[PDB]
PDB file of C-alpha atoms and ligand atoms in Angstrom:
ATOM      1  CA  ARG A   5       4.590 -32.805  62.469  1.00 43.88           C
ATOM      2  CA  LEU A   6       6.277 -32.877  65.958  1.00 45.12           C
ATOM      3  CA  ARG A   7       9.873 -31.953  65.352  1.00 44.06           C
ATOM      4  CA  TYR A   8      12.907 -33.838  66.630  1.00 45.37           C
ATOM      5  CA  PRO A   9      15.021 -32.215  67.953  1.00 44.13           C
ATOM      6  CA  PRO A  10      12.280 -29.746  69.112  1.00 41.99           C
ATOM      7  CA  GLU A  11      12.737 -25.905  69.188  1.00 40.07           C
ATOM      8  CA  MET A  12      11.315 -25.564  72.716  1.00 40.36           C
ATOM      9  CA  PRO A  13      11.354 -21.749  72.709  1.00 37.05           C
ATOM     10  CA  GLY A  14      12.223 -20.283  76.076  1.00 35.83           C
ATOM     11  CA  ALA A  15      13.618 -23.572  77.459  1.00 33.61           C
ATOM     12  CA  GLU A  16      16.963 -23.844  79.146  1.00 37.40           C
ATOM     13  CA  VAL A  17      18.727 -26.949  77.814  1.00 38.92           C
ATOM     14  CA  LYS A  18      20.681 -29.345  80.021  1.00 40.86           C
ATOM     15  CA  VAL A  19      22.298 -32.627  79.059  1.00 38.17           C
ATOM     16  CA  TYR A  20      21.184 -35.068  81.698  1.00 39.23           C
ATOM     17  CA  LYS A  21      22.818 -38.190  80.283  1.00 43.85           C
ATOM     18  CA  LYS A  22      25.521 -39.038  77.757  1.00 42.83           C
ATOM     19  CA  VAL A  23      25.107 -42.528  76.316  1.00 46.64           C
ATOM     20  CA  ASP A  24      25.818 -44.341  72.985  1.00 49.44           C
ATOM     21  CA  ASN A  25      27.394 -41.092  71.785  1.00 50.65           C
ATOM     22  CA  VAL A  26      24.120 -39.121  72.258  1.00 50.84           C
ATOM     23  CA  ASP A  27      23.464 -36.250  74.617  1.00 50.55           C
ATOM     24  CA  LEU A  28      20.045 -36.736  76.162  1.00 47.50           C
ATOM     25  CA  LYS A  29      18.520 -33.342  77.025  1.00 51.20           C
ATOM     26  CA  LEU A  30      16.066 -31.782  79.461  1.00 53.26           C
ATOM     27  CA  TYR A  31      14.185 -28.747  78.219  1.00 53.52           C
ATOM     28  CA  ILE A  32      13.683 -26.718  81.370  1.00 55.62           C
ATOM     29  CA  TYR A  33      11.003 -24.101  82.040  1.00 55.29           C
ATOM     30  CA  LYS A  34      11.384 -21.910  85.052  1.00 53.89           C
ATOM     31  CA  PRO A  35       8.816 -19.561  86.623  1.00 56.37           C
ATOM     32  CA  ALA A  36       9.219 -15.790  86.115  1.00 56.04           C
ATOM     33  CA  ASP A  37      10.260 -15.250  89.743  1.00 54.83           C
ATOM     34  CA  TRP A  38      12.699 -18.190  89.857  1.00 54.12           C
ATOM     35  CA  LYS A  39      15.778 -17.724  92.053  1.00 55.10           C
ATOM     36  CA  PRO A  40      18.604 -20.241  92.790  1.00 57.85           C
ATOM     37  CA  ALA A  41      17.832 -21.077  96.476  1.00 59.50           C
ATOM     38  CA  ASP A  42      14.132 -21.780  95.768  1.00 58.48           C
ATOM     39  CA  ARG A  43      12.785 -25.189  96.723  1.00 59.82           C
ATOM     40  CA  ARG A  44      10.044 -25.602  94.087  1.00 57.73           C
ATOM     41  CA  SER A  45       8.241 -28.775  93.037  1.00 55.79           C
ATOM     42  CA  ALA A  46       9.439 -30.090  89.692  1.00 56.54           C
ATOM     43  CA  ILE A  47       7.792 -32.028  86.901  1.00 57.60           C
ATOM     44  CA  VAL A  48       9.520 -34.113  84.219  1.00 58.67           C
ATOM     45  CA  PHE A  49       7.492 -35.106  81.123  1.00 58.77           C
ATOM     46  CA  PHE A  50       8.233 -38.093  78.910  1.00 61.21           C
ATOM     47  CA  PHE A  51       6.781 -38.047  75.405  1.00 59.53           C
ATOM     48  CA  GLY A  52       4.843 -40.931  73.825  1.00 59.62           C
ATOM     49  CA  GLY A  53       5.487 -42.782  70.589  1.00 60.55           C
ATOM     50  CA  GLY A  54       5.601 -46.514  71.345  1.00 58.02           C
ATOM     51  CA  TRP A  55       9.189 -46.356  72.570  1.00 54.96           C
ATOM     52  CA  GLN A  56       9.990 -45.926  68.802  1.00 55.47           C
ATOM     53  CA  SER A  57       9.513 -42.245  68.061  1.00 57.12           C
ATOM     54  CA  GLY A  58       8.129 -38.937  69.443  1.00 56.77           C
ATOM     55  CA  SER A  59       9.408 -35.584  70.649  1.00 58.13           C
ATOM     56  CA  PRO A  60       9.671 -33.576  73.887  1.00 55.62           C
ATOM     57  CA  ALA A  61       7.657 -30.924  71.960  1.00 57.33           C
ATOM     58  CA  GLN A  62       4.548 -32.917  72.809  1.00 61.12           C
ATOM     59  CA  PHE A  63       4.654 -31.644  76.371  1.00 62.23           C
ATOM     60  CA  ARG A  64       5.834 -28.062  75.783  1.00 66.03           C
ATOM     61  CA  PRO A  65       2.347 -26.626  76.447  1.00 66.70           C
ATOM     62  CA  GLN A  66       2.075 -28.476  79.792  1.00 66.30           C
ATOM     63  CA  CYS A  67       5.592 -27.343  80.797  1.00 67.50           C
ATOM     64  CA  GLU A  68       4.661 -23.711  80.111  1.00 66.60           C
ATOM     65  CA  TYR A  69       1.485 -24.183  82.165  1.00 66.18           C
ATOM     66  CA  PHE A  70       3.247 -25.653  85.184  1.00 67.23           C
ATOM     67  CA  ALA A  71       6.101 -23.156  85.054  1.00 69.20           C
ATOM     68  CA  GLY A  72       3.398 -20.434  85.174  1.00 66.54           C
ATOM     69  CA  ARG A  73       2.137 -22.112  88.335  1.00 66.54           C
ATOM     70  CA  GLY A  74       5.562 -21.936  90.053  1.00 65.72           C
ATOM     71  CA  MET A  75       7.058 -25.346  89.169  1.00 65.42           C
ATOM     72  CA  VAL A  76      10.335 -26.073  87.463  1.00 63.90           C
ATOM     73  CA  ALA A  77       8.823 -27.959  84.531  1.00 64.84           C
ATOM     74  CA  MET A  78      10.735 -29.926  81.974  1.00 65.11           C
ATOM     75  CA  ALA A  79      10.426 -32.249  79.047  1.00 67.68           C
ATOM     76  CA  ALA A  80      13.028 -35.007  78.753  1.00 69.15           C
ATOM     77  CA  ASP A  81      14.433 -36.626  75.692  1.00 68.47           C
ATOM     78  CA  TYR A  82      15.072 -40.367  75.894  1.00 70.07           C
ATOM     79  CA  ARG A  83      16.396 -42.978  73.490  1.00 69.48           C
ATOM     80  CA  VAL A  84      13.885 -44.607  71.154  1.00 66.43           C
ATOM     81  CA  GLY A  85      13.931 -47.477  68.662  1.00 69.27           C
ATOM     82  CA  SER A  86      13.843 -45.523  65.389  1.00 68.97           C
ATOM     83  CA  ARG A  87      16.730 -43.193  66.299  1.00 70.22           C
ATOM     84  CA  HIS A  88      18.865 -45.236  68.703  1.00 70.71           C
ATOM     85  CA  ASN A  89      17.952 -48.922  68.110  1.00 74.72           C
ATOM     86  CA  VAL A  90      17.203 -49.331  71.810  1.00 78.12           C
ATOM     87  CA  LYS A  91      14.620 -51.525  73.563  1.00 77.19           C
ATOM     88  CA  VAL A  92      12.032 -50.557  76.219  1.00 77.57           C
ATOM     89  CA  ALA A  93      14.426 -51.358  79.109  1.00 81.28           C
ATOM     90  CA  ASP A  94      16.851 -48.731  77.741  1.00 79.55           C
ATOM     91  CA  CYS A  95      14.061 -46.102  77.647  1.00 77.48           C
ATOM     92  CA  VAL A  96      13.285 -46.988  81.267  1.00 76.50           C
ATOM     93  CA  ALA A  97      16.933 -46.524  82.250  1.00 73.30           C
ATOM     94  CA  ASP A  98      16.956 -43.073  80.579  1.00 74.41           C
ATOM     95  CA  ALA A  99      13.780 -41.992  82.383  1.00 76.71           C
ATOM     96  CA  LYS A 100      15.313 -43.137  85.690  1.00 81.42           C
ATOM     97  CA  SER A 101      18.516 -41.243  84.788  1.00 78.25           C
ATOM     98  CA  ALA A 102      16.429 -38.085  84.239  1.00 77.84           C
ATOM     99  CA  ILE A 103      14.776 -38.202  87.699  1.00 74.52           C
ATOM    100  CA  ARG A 104      18.223 -38.987  89.281  1.00 73.65           C
ATOM    101  CA  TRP A 105      19.766 -36.031  87.539  1.00 71.00           C
ATOM    102  CA  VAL A 106      17.051 -33.613  88.598  1.00 67.41           C
ATOM    103  CA  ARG A 107      17.387 -34.877  92.164  1.00 66.66           C
ATOM    104  CA  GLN A 108      21.230 -34.690  91.979  1.00 66.67           C
ATOM    105  CA  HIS A 109      21.012 -31.148  90.633  1.00 68.44           C
ATOM    106  CA  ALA A 110      17.972 -30.086  92.692  1.00 72.86           C
ATOM    107  CA  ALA A 111      19.851 -27.252  94.455  1.00 78.05           C
ATOM    108  CA  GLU A 112      20.969 -25.439  91.327  1.00 78.14           C
ATOM    109  CA  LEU A 113      17.533 -26.017  89.736  1.00 77.81           C
ATOM    110  CA  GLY A 114      15.785 -24.278  92.672  1.00 75.43           C
ATOM    111  CA  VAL A 115      13.972 -27.558  93.333  1.00 75.97           C
ATOM    112  CA  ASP A 116      12.868 -29.530  96.359  1.00 74.76           C
ATOM    113  CA  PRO A 117      14.438 -32.987  95.764  1.00 72.30           C
ATOM    114  CA  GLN A 118      11.411 -34.676  97.368  1.00 69.72           C
ATOM    115  CA  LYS A 119       8.808 -32.917  95.156  1.00 69.34           C
ATOM    116  CA  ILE A 120       9.797 -34.315  91.761  1.00 69.88           C
ATOM    117  CA  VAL A 121       6.822 -35.460  89.637  1.00 69.94           C
ATOM    118  CA  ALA A 122       7.264 -37.913  86.743  1.00 69.22           C
ATOM    119  CA  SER A 123       4.709 -37.535  83.958  1.00 70.40           C
ATOM    120  CA  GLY A 124       4.124 -38.712  80.403  1.00 70.72           C
ATOM    121  CA  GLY A 125       1.837 -39.943  77.661  1.00 70.38           C
ATOM    122  CA  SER A 126       1.358 -43.554  76.624  1.00 71.18           C
ATOM    123  CA  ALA A 127       4.858 -45.092  76.304  1.00 71.25           C
ATOM    124  CA  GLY A 128       6.125 -42.002  78.187  1.00 68.46           C
ATOM    125  CA  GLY A 129       3.411 -42.557  80.826  1.00 71.02           C
ATOM    126  CA  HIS A 130       4.797 -46.075  81.137  1.00 65.80           C
ATOM    127  CA  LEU A 131       8.249 -44.607  81.745  1.00 64.49           C
ATOM    128  CA  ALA A 132       6.891 -42.192  84.367  1.00 66.20           C
ATOM    129  CA  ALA A 133       5.163 -45.077  86.107  1.00 66.39           C
ATOM    130  CA  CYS A 134       8.458 -47.083  86.036  1.00 67.25           C
ATOM    131  CA  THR A 135      10.278 -44.225  87.773  1.00 65.91           C
ATOM    132  CA  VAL A 136       7.674 -44.307  90.616  1.00 63.90           C
ATOM    133  CA  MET A 137       7.346 -48.040  91.136  1.00 64.48           C
ATOM    134  CA  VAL A 138       9.650 -50.410  89.179  1.00 64.54           C
ATOM    135  CA  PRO A 139      13.095 -51.285  90.549  1.00 63.57           C
ATOM    136  CA  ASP A 140      16.110 -49.906  88.685  1.00 64.94           C
ATOM    137  CA  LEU A 141      17.335 -52.527  86.200  1.00 65.82           C
ATOM    138  CA  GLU A 142      20.830 -51.115  85.684  1.00 67.88           C
ATOM    139  CA  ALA A 143      23.244 -49.119  87.776  1.00 70.26           C
ATOM    140  CA  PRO A 144      23.977 -45.795  86.158  1.00 70.27           C
ATOM    141  CA  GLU A 145      27.517 -44.681  85.262  1.00 67.51           C
ATOM    142  CA  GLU A 146      26.322 -41.240  86.581  1.00 63.66           C
ATOM    143  CA  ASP A 147      24.892 -40.250  90.008  1.00 60.79           C
ATOM    144  CA  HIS A 148      25.106 -43.686  91.509  1.00 56.84           C
ATOM    145  CA  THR A 149      23.818 -43.089  95.083  1.00 56.07           C
ATOM    146  CA  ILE A 150      20.919 -40.637  94.369  1.00 57.87           C
ATOM    147  CA  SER A 151      17.404 -42.197  94.167  1.00 57.29           C
ATOM    148  CA  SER A 152      15.790 -42.438  90.711  1.00 58.77           C
ATOM    149  CA  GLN A 153      12.346 -42.680  92.288  1.00 57.62           C
ATOM    150  CA  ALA A 154       9.857 -39.913  91.561  1.00 59.66           C
ATOM    151  CA  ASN A 155       7.775 -38.514  94.420  1.00 59.28           C
ATOM    152  CA  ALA A 156       4.512 -38.511  92.433  1.00 57.85           C
ATOM    153  CA  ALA A 157       3.194 -39.299  88.979  1.00 57.27           C
ATOM    154  CA  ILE A 158       0.757 -37.770  86.470  1.00 57.32           C
ATOM    155  CA  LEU A 159      -0.022 -40.239  83.715  1.00 58.00           C
ATOM    156  CA  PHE A 160      -1.765 -39.543  80.413  1.00 55.71           C
ATOM    157  CA  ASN A 161      -3.179 -42.839  78.989  1.00 56.26           C
ATOM    158  CA  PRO A 162      -0.146 -44.852  80.122  1.00 56.57           C
ATOM    159  CA  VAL A 163       0.826 -48.396  79.279  1.00 54.55           C
ATOM    160  CA  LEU A 164       0.865 -50.189  82.674  1.00 54.16           C
ATOM    161  CA  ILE A 165       0.562 -53.966  81.932  1.00 51.14           C
ATOM    162  CA  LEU A 166       3.447 -55.416  79.892  1.00 51.22           C
ATOM    163  CA  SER A 167       3.331 -59.100  81.011  1.00 49.20           C
ATOM    164  CA  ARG A 168       0.399 -61.497  80.930  1.00 49.54           C
ATOM    165  CA  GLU A 169       1.427 -63.242  84.158  1.00 51.12           C
ATOM    166  CA  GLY A 170      -1.170 -63.291  86.926  1.00 51.09           C
ATOM    167  CA  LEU A 171      -3.968 -62.431  84.440  1.00 52.01           C
ATOM    168  CA  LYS A 172      -7.013 -64.471  83.253  1.00 55.09           C
ATOM    169  CA  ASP A 173      -5.392 -65.604  79.981  1.00 54.29           C
ATOM    170  CA  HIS A 174      -7.131 -68.939  79.384  1.00 55.54           C
ATOM    171  CA  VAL A 175      -4.022 -70.805  78.049  1.00 53.55           C
ATOM    172  CA  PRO A 176      -0.360 -70.480  79.147  1.00 53.14           C
ATOM    173  CA  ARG A 177       1.368 -68.505  76.372  1.00 53.48           C
ATOM    174  CA  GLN A 178       4.923 -68.679  77.705  1.00 55.25           C
ATOM    175  CA  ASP A 179       5.885 -68.155  74.037  1.00 56.25           C
ATOM    176  CA  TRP A 180       4.248 -64.695  74.135  1.00 59.77           C
ATOM    177  CA  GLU A 181       6.351 -63.888  77.208  1.00 62.15           C
ATOM    178  CA  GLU A 182       9.596 -65.081  75.474  1.00 62.99           C
ATOM    179  CA  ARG A 183       8.790 -62.852  72.493  1.00 62.87           C
ATOM    180  CA  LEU A 184       8.150 -59.952  74.893  1.00 66.08           C
ATOM    181  CA  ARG A 185      11.502 -60.608  76.604  1.00 62.79           C
ATOM    182  CA  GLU A 186      13.225 -60.241  73.216  1.00 64.08           C
ATOM    183  CA  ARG A 187      11.250 -57.033  72.372  1.00 66.09           C
ATOM    184  CA  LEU A 188      11.641 -55.378  75.791  1.00 63.32           C
ATOM    185  CA  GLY A 189      15.287 -56.228  76.498  1.00 67.45           C
ATOM    186  CA  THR A 190      14.453 -57.849  79.831  1.00 67.41           C
ATOM    187  CA  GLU A 191      11.921 -60.017  81.637  1.00 65.71           C
ATOM    188  CA  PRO A 192       8.502 -58.410  80.832  1.00 65.73           C
ATOM    189  CA  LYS A 193       7.480 -58.215  84.518  1.00 67.67           C
ATOM    190  CA  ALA A 194      10.572 -56.094  85.239  1.00 66.36           C
ATOM    191  CA  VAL A 195       9.172 -53.210  83.086  1.00 64.38           C
ATOM    192  CA  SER A 196       5.450 -53.879  83.911  1.00 65.23           C
ATOM    193  CA  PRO A 197       4.159 -51.387  86.464  1.00 62.54           C
ATOM    194  CA  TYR A 198       1.130 -53.570  87.264  1.00 65.75           C
ATOM    195  CA  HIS A 199       3.419 -56.364  88.458  1.00 67.38           C
ATOM    196  CA  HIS A 200       5.017 -54.060  91.047  1.00 67.84           C
ATOM    197  CA  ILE A 201       1.914 -52.885  92.851  1.00 67.41           C
ATOM    198  CA  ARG A 202       2.674 -52.773  96.569  1.00 66.64           C
ATOM    199  CA  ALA A 203       1.853 -50.607  99.591  1.00 69.22           C
ATOM    200  CA  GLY A 204       3.781 -47.447 100.361  1.00 69.04           C
ATOM    201  CA  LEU A 205       4.119 -46.097  96.813  1.00 69.79           C
ATOM    202  CA  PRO A 206       4.050 -42.491  95.728  1.00 69.88           C
ATOM    203  CA  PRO A 207       0.734 -40.915  94.788  1.00 72.52           C
ATOM    204  CA  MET A 208      -0.530 -40.591  91.238  1.00 74.30           C
ATOM    205  CA  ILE A 209      -3.308 -39.461  88.921  1.00 74.73           C
ATOM    206  CA  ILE A 210      -4.170 -41.217  85.648  1.00 76.00           C
ATOM    207  CA  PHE A 211      -6.220 -39.804  82.731  1.00 76.25           C
ATOM    208  CA  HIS A 212      -7.539 -42.473  80.343  1.00 77.07           C
ATOM    209  CA  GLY A 213     -10.171 -42.565  77.591  1.00 78.67           C
ATOM    210  CA  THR A 214     -12.783 -45.304  77.866  1.00 78.62           C
ATOM    211  CA  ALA A 215     -12.703 -45.814  74.064  1.00 81.65           C
ATOM    212  CA  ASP A 216      -8.926 -46.297  73.917  1.00 85.19           C
ATOM    213  CA  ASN A 217      -8.136 -48.922  71.241  1.00 84.99           C
ATOM    214  CA  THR A 218      -4.344 -48.872  71.896  1.00 84.12           C
ATOM    215  CA  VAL A 219      -4.287 -49.280  75.676  1.00 85.25           C
ATOM    216  CA  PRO A 220      -7.513 -50.812  76.919  1.00 85.19           C
ATOM    217  CA  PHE A 221      -9.202 -48.833  79.659  1.00 83.79           C
ATOM    218  CA  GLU A 222      -9.807 -52.085  81.521  1.00 86.69           C
ATOM    219  CA  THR A 223      -6.011 -52.587  82.036  1.00 86.24           C
ATOM    220  CA  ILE A 224      -5.945 -49.172  83.784  1.00 84.93           C
ATOM    221  CA  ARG A 225      -9.077 -49.891  85.894  1.00 84.94           C
ATOM    222  CA  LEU A 226      -7.427 -53.140  87.058  1.00 83.78           C
ATOM    223  CA  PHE A 227      -4.257 -51.250  87.901  1.00 82.36           C
ATOM    224  CA  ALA A 228      -6.047 -48.484  89.823  1.00 82.81           C
ATOM    225  CA  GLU A 229      -8.294 -50.995  91.677  1.00 85.09           C
ATOM    226  CA  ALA A 230      -5.223 -52.920  92.827  1.00 86.88           C
ATOM    227  CA  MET A 231      -3.288 -49.768  93.801  1.00 91.84           C
ATOM    228  CA  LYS A 232      -6.201 -48.574  95.970  1.00 89.76           C
ATOM    229  CA  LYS A 233      -6.482 -52.026  97.600  1.00 91.81           C
ATOM    230  CA  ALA A 234      -2.749 -51.644  98.462  1.00 90.84           C
ATOM    231  CA  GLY A 235      -3.550 -48.337 100.149  1.00 91.06           C
ATOM    232  CA  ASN A 236      -2.006 -46.062  97.509  1.00 91.83           C
ATOM    233  CA  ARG A 237      -3.478 -42.790  96.296  1.00 91.98           C
ATOM    234  CA  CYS A 238      -4.162 -43.564  92.669  1.00 91.93           C
ATOM    235  CA  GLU A 239      -6.770 -41.274  91.113  1.00 94.94           C
ATOM    236  CA  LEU A 240      -8.276 -42.658  87.907  1.00 95.82           C
ATOM    237  CA  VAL A 241     -10.079 -40.087  85.761  1.00 99.49           C
ATOM    238  CA  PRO A 242     -11.982 -41.707  82.894  1.00 97.44           C
ATOM    239  CA  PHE A 243     -12.762 -39.742  79.756  1.00 97.52           C
ATOM    240  CA  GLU A 244     -15.958 -41.329  78.465  1.00 99.75           C
ATOM    241  CA  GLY A 245     -15.739 -42.111  74.758  1.00 97.87           C
ATOM    242  CA  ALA A 246     -12.267 -40.615  74.374  1.00 97.41           C
ATOM    243  CA  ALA A 247      -9.599 -42.229  72.228  1.00 96.85           C
ATOM    244  CA  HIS A 248      -5.838 -42.691  72.755  1.00 94.13           C
ATOM    245  CA  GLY A 249      -4.122 -39.296  72.747  1.00 92.47           C
ATOM    246  CA  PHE A 250      -7.342 -37.368  73.650  1.00 92.89           C
ATOM    247  CA  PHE A 251      -5.450 -35.200  76.202  1.00 92.51           C
ATOM    248  CA  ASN A 252      -2.963 -33.652  73.774  1.00 96.40           C
ATOM    249  CA  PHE A 253      -2.775 -29.938  73.105  1.00 95.60           C
ATOM    250  CA  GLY A 254      -4.525 -29.375  69.702  1.00 96.25           C
ATOM    251  CA  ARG A 255      -7.078 -32.253  70.050  1.00 93.16           C
ATOM    252  CA  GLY A 256     -10.872 -31.777  70.358  1.00 90.29           C
ATOM    253  CA  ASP A 257     -10.845 -27.971  70.844  1.00 88.21           C
ATOM    254  CA  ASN A 258      -8.310 -28.351  73.696  1.00 88.35           C
ATOM    255  CA  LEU A 259     -11.179 -29.307  76.060  1.00 89.33           C
ATOM    256  CA  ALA A 260      -9.544 -32.520  77.291  1.00 89.60           C
ATOM    257  CA  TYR A 261      -6.153 -30.721  77.373  1.00 91.21           C
ATOM    258  CA  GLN A 262      -7.576 -28.019  79.640  1.00 94.33           C
ATOM    259  CA  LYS A 263      -9.497 -30.452  81.790  1.00 93.97           C
ATOM    260  CA  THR A 264      -6.472 -32.724  82.373  1.00 94.88           C
ATOM    261  CA  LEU A 265      -4.398 -29.726  83.337  1.00 94.67           C
ATOM    262  CA  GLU A 266      -6.997 -28.449  85.834  1.00 93.70           C
ATOM    263  CA  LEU A 267      -7.260 -31.891  87.406  1.00 89.66           C
ATOM    264  CA  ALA A 268      -3.470 -32.501  87.425  1.00 89.28           C
ATOM    265  CA  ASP A 269      -3.126 -29.066  89.075  1.00 85.74           C
ATOM    266  CA  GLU A 270      -5.700 -29.903  91.743  1.00 84.52           C
ATOM    267  CA  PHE A 271      -3.891 -33.206  92.342  1.00 84.79           C
ATOM    268  CA  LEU A 272      -0.596 -31.417  92.985  1.00 83.39           C
ATOM    269  CA  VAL A 273      -2.357 -29.042  95.369  1.00 79.41           C
ATOM    270  CA  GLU A 274      -3.946 -32.058  97.119  1.00 77.20           C
ATOM    271  CA  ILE A 275      -0.575 -33.720  97.678  1.00 70.96           C
ATOM    272  CA  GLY A 276       1.086 -30.481  98.794  1.00 69.55           C
ATOM    273  CA  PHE A 277       3.330 -29.995  95.770  1.00 68.71           C
ATOM    274  CA  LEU A 278       1.652 -26.760  94.605  1.00 70.00           C
ATOM    275  CA  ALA A 279       0.174 -23.843  96.476  1.00 70.49           C
ATOM    276  CA  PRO A 280      -3.552 -23.310  95.869  1.00 69.21           C
ATOM    277  CA  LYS A 281      -4.317 -20.760  93.136  1.00 65.64           C
ATOM    278  CA  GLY A 282      -4.077 -17.213  94.589  1.00 66.91           C
TER     279      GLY A 282
HETATM  280 CL1  LIG B 301      -7.861 -45.244  70.491  1.00 66.44          CL
END
């Protein structure tokens, strides 16, 4: 019941990438007092759906929230398996193309090109994480010299471990890695945020349910532990007993929705991307 293509009432629509004969769109929400020479922080949301399905509609409520707070907030479309027959590496390239485009067009968007936040849920959280910390896998036909790298991330139960290398798997299952290579369209490590943990990365906040049966909470704890040891600001907010998707607008009386927004907001204030309320 999440429509594709979404209505996105009140959004300005921009095509950020043309590829395989599809126009990939950003649904852009500006604040009421937006003017062209502004230098606002921006946020780009990537929907979840296993890199197979989903809709930018998922993050419309969050875009409206952050536009109300003075950000240029947007939800990005990206290619997925069920509609475009792509693999995960393609989705990653699209997400990188979105951040590049916003940076490239920062002036006309009224945006500070160094305050661009990547955000998303599950598979889309994975994409957001890739824009912050995984090297580009392919050179774009558009905007070649602009960085794709986001300046911060806000992740809603992301997928962050996509390879089993350097883990405590008791037997070598190189076969599992070969199968992953075929599914992902590249070497699994090359789209596995966990395998790119290093010092000097942009800051992030992660919301994850401790009862998540799709993405184990322990994968996220490992990630955050390692990020902190590398000296990165990586705030892990557990939601005790919560399941995958807990944060969505319309779930559990919107309590987790509201809480994640408050905390994401405080994060952005903490890192200097938003003015304190008032
Ligand atoms: Cl779950």
